[PDB]
Amino acid sequence: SGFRKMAFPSGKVEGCMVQVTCGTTTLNGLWLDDVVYCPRHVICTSEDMLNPNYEDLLIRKSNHNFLVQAGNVQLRVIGHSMQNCVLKLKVDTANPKTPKYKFVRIQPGQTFSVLACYNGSPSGVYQCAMRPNFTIKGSFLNGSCGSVGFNIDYDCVSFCYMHHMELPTGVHAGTDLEGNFYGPFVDRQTAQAAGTDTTITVNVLAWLYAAVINGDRWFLNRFTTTLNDFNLVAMKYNYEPLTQDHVDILGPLSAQTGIAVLDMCASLKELLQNGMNGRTILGSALLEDEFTPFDVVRQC
Amino acid sequence: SGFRKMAFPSGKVEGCMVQVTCGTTTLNGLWLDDVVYCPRHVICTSEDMLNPNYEDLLIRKSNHNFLVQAGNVQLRVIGHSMQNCVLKLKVDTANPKTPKYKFVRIQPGQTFSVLACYNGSPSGVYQCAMRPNFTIKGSFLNGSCGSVGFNIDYDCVSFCYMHHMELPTGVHAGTDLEGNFYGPFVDRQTAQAAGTDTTITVNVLAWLYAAVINGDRWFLNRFTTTLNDFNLVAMKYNYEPLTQDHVDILGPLSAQTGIAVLDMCASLKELLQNGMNGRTILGSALLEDEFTPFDVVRQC
């Protein structure tokens, strides 16, 4: 029983975090085999950030301009290259703690664990969802750049996010581990801002299933609705549209609770139209959208 | 920016989790130096759980009745003893991954990280608070017994909780690492239930400071209140009483935001009396009480 935002155990990732310094800038890097991955903006000065030409900035650097430290051990940089918005620093030592890993790119609506780091040192771990607008609502302070997001399945770490910057609303933007940004964001100084967002409908339904599994049933009803009628209500309340694949993905939770997906959609329609009338669901007074169907099955 | 329930990095604890089996019961143990700590109810059969005499049950056991596995390595049990509600299994191998550690007992209102485990295998990590009624609102399924709660300070792991059981409301009860239960709970079958709970007032104030630090200011006012007048309102809304020590503990956050503690207490009084009127604080429509002043300073 119970339901918490739960992150994956972070040990496998902790053993990969290092500190990268170039000039007066220190941030975090990810050390896998003999490569250290970090944000390329580590090579920029404050002035460089307006209209930086990273190709020119990187040609003016050499291996000795990058200081890499794993704990108290200095790692010798023997090569450097740029891959999209990430820097790849070849080092003379393969990380003996390298887990089985993969570089995956996630979709909006999916969740992952973040290991917030500062100066190569892990500070905390929490769960995040990639929002529909490609931003994440993380918790990051100055020096968190290079922190990574990941999922773990059968001891294999699937890295999906590297932290690059904070946008004006306090939300966060970053790339995949191949250095490709999530969303229409750039690693240069602009007035870039998060675009309009929407609520992840399939995740809200998954969370209602988790609530029913944990004994919250006040929002249930005998009514059902059609997918088309539910989608008209979703559109009115800025909720993502629900597809048949979403309905199929919710099958296992529907079967376990005996509540048809379209029956739960009728409950969600009522909650959007009437509110909770002072009641709560899994300790929340708002509809939660940062738990995927997999997150609910994993914990419930 | 941002504010999340954030757990400590769990690697140091992951390296201590083992699987303990006795009879047909498997649960988790904590392996530190050459001792494995686990719930003593591992030695009970279902029938044993009504009126168990643990002293008699443990005399009828021998070292070979305990199977301990660290990953795929079997650890030989060479001694066994009872300490309050925990069992201490002496093993022939000191854990080479033992961190610097301490056994601390926490107070109600304090927070800690939980590493949920199943069959000796870490599944996830999340933050919990010890409630005023000595229960925790965790996320634990069958097999989670022996999972531990902890805090980390400068590489030293302060273990404060071992999981023993789920109460009828879905909340959780356990002991400190010396085997002493938190609250009026026992490791035997009874109709024991969580007692009445209260809201942790000092934590709510800390969270309002975190909200102000992150740009939420709609609930602020020019009014102030006295500690005595605030305490009469706290008592009416089932909030713990606020003491001068609490006010002193909130000093740093008060100084950083320039909002006097009693000025923030006037904001909390208004929120309790009027509600939020459809607004939210740090993404919540409820007053959060599971972040301590230290949690806010750590992340903000």
From Swiss-Prot, chains A, B:
Domain (Peptidase C30): residue spans on this chain: 1-300
Cross-link (Glycyl lysine isopeptide (Lys-Gly) (interchain with G-Cter in ubiquitin)): 5, 90
Localization per Swiss-Prot or TrEMBL: Host cytoplasm; Host Golgi apparatus; Host nucleus
Intervals, Cytoplasmic compartment: 1-300
Activity regulation summary: Inhibited by pyridone-containing alpha-ketoamides compounds 13a and 13b. In turn, alpha-ketoamide 13b (tert-butyl (1-((S)-1-(((S)-4-(benzylamino)-3,4-dioxo-1-((S)-2-oxopyrrolidin-3-yl)butan-2-yl)amino)-3-cyclopropyl-1-oxopropan-2-yl)-2-oxo-1,2-dihydropyridin-3-yl)carbamate) inhibits SARS-CoV-2 replication in human lung cells. Inhibited ex vivo by michael acceptor inhibitor N3. Inhibited ex vivo by compound 11a and 11b.
Active-site residues, record numbering mapped to chain: 41, 145
Domain of life of the native organism: Viruses
Phenotype when changing residue 142 to A: Does not affect ability to cleave and inactivate human TRMT1
Recorded catalytic activity of this chain's protein: TSAVLQ-|-SGFRK-NH2 and SGVTFQ-|-GKFKK the two peptides corresponding to the two self-cleavage sites of the SARS 3C-like proteinase are the two most reactive peptide substrates. The enzyme exhibits a strong preference for substrates containing Gln at P1 position and Leu at P2 position
Outcome of mutating residue 205 to V: In strain: Zeta/P.2
Functional note: Cleaves the C-terminus of replicase polyprotein at 11 sites. Recognizes substrates containing the core sequence [ILMVF]-Q-|-[SGACN]. Cleaves and inactivates human TRMT1, preventing tRNA guanine(26)-dimethylation of tRNAs. May cleave human NLRP1 in lung epithelial cells, thereby activating the NLRP1 inflammasome pathway. May cleave human GSDMD, triggering alternative GSDME-mediated epithelial cell death upon activation of the NLRP1 inflammasome, which may enhance the release interleukins 1B, 6, 16 and 18. Also able to bind an ADP-ribose-1''-phosphate (ADRP).
UniProt subunit comment: 3CL-PRO exists as monomer and homodimer. Only the homodimer shows catalytic activity. Interacts with host FBXO22; this interaction promotes the proteasomal degradation of nsp5.
Protein name: 3C-like proteinase nsp5
Organism: Severe acute respiratory syndrome coronavirus 2
Covered residues, full protein: 3264 to 3563 of 7096
